[PDB]
Amino acid sequence: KYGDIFTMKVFGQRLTFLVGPDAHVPFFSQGDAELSQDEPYQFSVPIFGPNVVYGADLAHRNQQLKFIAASLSTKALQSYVPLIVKEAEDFFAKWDKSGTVDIRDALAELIILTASRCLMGKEIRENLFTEVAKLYQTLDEGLLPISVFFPYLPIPAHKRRDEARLAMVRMFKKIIDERRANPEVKHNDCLQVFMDARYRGEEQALNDEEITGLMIALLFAGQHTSSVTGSWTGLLLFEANNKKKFLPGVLEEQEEIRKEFGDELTMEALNKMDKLHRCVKEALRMYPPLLFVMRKVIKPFSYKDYYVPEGDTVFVSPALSMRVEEVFPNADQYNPERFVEEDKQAQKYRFVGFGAGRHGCMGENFAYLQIKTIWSVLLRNFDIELVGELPKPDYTAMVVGPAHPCLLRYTRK
Numbered sequence: 001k002y003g004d005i006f007t008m009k010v011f012g013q014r015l016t017f018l019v020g021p022d023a024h025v026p027f028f029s030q031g032d033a034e035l036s037q038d039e040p041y042q043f044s045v046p047i048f049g050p051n052v053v054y055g056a057d058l059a060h061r062n063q064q065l066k067f068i069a070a071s072l073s074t075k076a077l078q079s080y081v082p083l084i085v086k087e088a089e090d091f092f093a094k095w096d097k098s099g100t101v102d103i104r105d106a107l108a109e110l111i112i113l114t115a116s117r118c119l120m121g122k123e124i125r126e127n128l129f130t131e132v133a134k135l136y137q138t139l140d141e142g143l144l145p146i147s148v149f150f151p152y153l154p155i156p157a158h159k160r161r162d163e164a165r166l167a168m169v170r171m172f173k174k175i176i177d178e179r180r181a182n183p184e185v186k187h188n189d190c191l192q193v194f195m196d197a198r199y200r201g202e203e204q205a206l207n208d209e210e211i212t213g214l215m216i217a218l219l220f221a222g223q224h225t226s227s228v229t230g231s232w233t234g235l236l237l238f239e240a241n242n243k244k245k246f247l248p249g250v251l252e253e254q255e256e257i258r259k260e261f262g263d264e265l266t267m268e269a270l271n272k273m274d275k276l277h278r279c280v281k282e283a284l285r286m287y288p289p290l291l292f293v294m295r296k297v298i299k300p301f302s303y304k305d306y307y308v309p310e311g312d313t314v315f316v317s318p319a320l321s322m323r324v325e326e327v328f329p330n331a332d333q334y335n336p337e338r339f340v341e342e343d344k345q346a347q348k349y350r351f352v353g354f355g356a357g358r359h360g361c362m363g364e365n366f367a368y369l370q371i372k373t374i375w376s377v378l379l380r381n382f383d384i385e386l387v388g389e390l391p392k393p394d395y396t397a398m399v400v401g402p403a404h405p406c407l408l409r410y411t412r413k
């Protein structure tokens with residue numbers, strides 16, 4: 001079991017898989033001239049919309065990615081964290097003195113609530129949430145297996161998808177027009193950043209399609225990644241064995257933070273929760289939400305004496321790569337504290353839950369803050385137990401989440 005590169009031919013296409021840190025090197029270390037995202041990620045274009053992300057040419061795409069990075073910078077996150085905390089506290093306040101919850105359903109709800117606020121702004125959060133959630137659900141239901149091959153197939157799900165997108169644009173057109181009418185009012189959200197964004201060489205702001213598309217993209221990200229890793233984080237920690245070993249260190253750490261900082265959850269406090277961080281990271285190691293990341297090969301390369309020609313699609317599976325024993329001792333065991341030592345390793349591309357290199361996750365820090373917020377609030381206010389077996393990965397959506405039901409029992413402290 002030290003195969004680390006192999007090829008299928010399927011549908012007349014050569015798929016080449018790269019497993020483990022050495023094989024990863026040609027995937028992550030190269031750039032846009034050598035590897036292309038366009039063709040593998042076609043499926044996303046009619047979801048986010050035309051001329052947005054993988055539907056834009058490189059020139060525009062590279063600038064859109066800089067806008068996104070700005071919207072999720074450290075500075076921006078400082079101002080979002082209060083919002084993220086409030087939403088979480090309001091949400092879990094609604095909970096009874098004890099009961100049972102599907103954690104996956106719950107965190108999907110909370111994360112899309114929070115995202116609507118930070119991404120899309122107060123107006124939408126407070127006036128139009130239900131409309132936005134419904135429109136998103138429709139978008140998401142137009143992502144079928146067939147859609148990765150034929151995105152613009154005129155089947156019903158695709159029609160409703162396209163209609164839902166256009167509706168979403170119309171909704172934001174109103175908010176944007178109102179904001180341009182009153183442009184001296186500052187707003188704390190990604191929308192503001194996208195409204196102030198300008199392409200270079202041009203007095204051109206993004207139109208409403210592009211702005212809406214960038215926000216669909218980021219909403220999609222949170223629902224497809226953060227919400228699942230957020231669920232696993234708890235499912236894994238509050239399994240009886242894992243709970244025994246690891247929860248003490250976590251609860252201790254929360255109390256040490258409260259003594260230095262107080263009851264208030266802040267950027268600085270969350271940034272100190274190392275043991276909780278590693279719990280999230282280990283859930284991510286074991287059940288990464290993205291099955292594959294992919295590129296079309298433009299410039300051929302060899303790894304060992306294995307030749308990968310132009311026109312190949314190369315794949316990395318974070319799931320596979322991070323179950324390799326040579327890299328991760330007891331690969332199939334839950335051990336958060338592996339990352340004390342693992343984090344000190346010099347060799348690149350061992351952990352690839354957030355990808356790496358030029359196109360690594362720009363939302364990593366946001367994800368950690370969102371997920372640590374959730375579990376900080378939960379840990380501080382409840383005693384929690386896993387109901388039954390640890391769920392198995394469910395591969396039906398275009399996302400690998402824990403299979404329903406994902407039940408936790410809670411009792412208030």
Ligand code: HEM
Nearest residue numbers: 218221222225226229293353354355359360361362363367
């Ligand atoms: C724990 C949750 C998350 C995981 C596991 C995750 C994972 C990843 C991975 C593996 C990539 C690389 C994709 C590729 O190479 O093609 C990526 C890219 C990206 N992620 Fe995330 N992500 C997460 C959360 C987020 C969040 C919350 C956002 C923002 C809303 C976000 C925004 C992005 C963006 C914009 C990229 C594009 C990188 C590029 O093409 O340059 N992610 N993410």
Ligand SMILES: O[C@@](Cn1cnnn1)(c1ccc(F)cc1F)C(F)(F)c1ccc(-c2ccc(OCC(F)(F)F)cc2)cn1
Nearest residue numbers: 041044148217218220221222224225290291292293361363
């Ligand atoms: O990488 C994403 C997802 N993401 C990244 N971070 N959080 N979510 C992405 C990238 C940039 C964004 F702005 C928003 C995004 F959501 C993405 F571009 F849409 C994306 C890329 C690849 C996949 C993907 C994952 C697994 C797949 O399985 C392969 C198979 F379907 F079997 F053929 C197929 C596709 C999903 N989303």
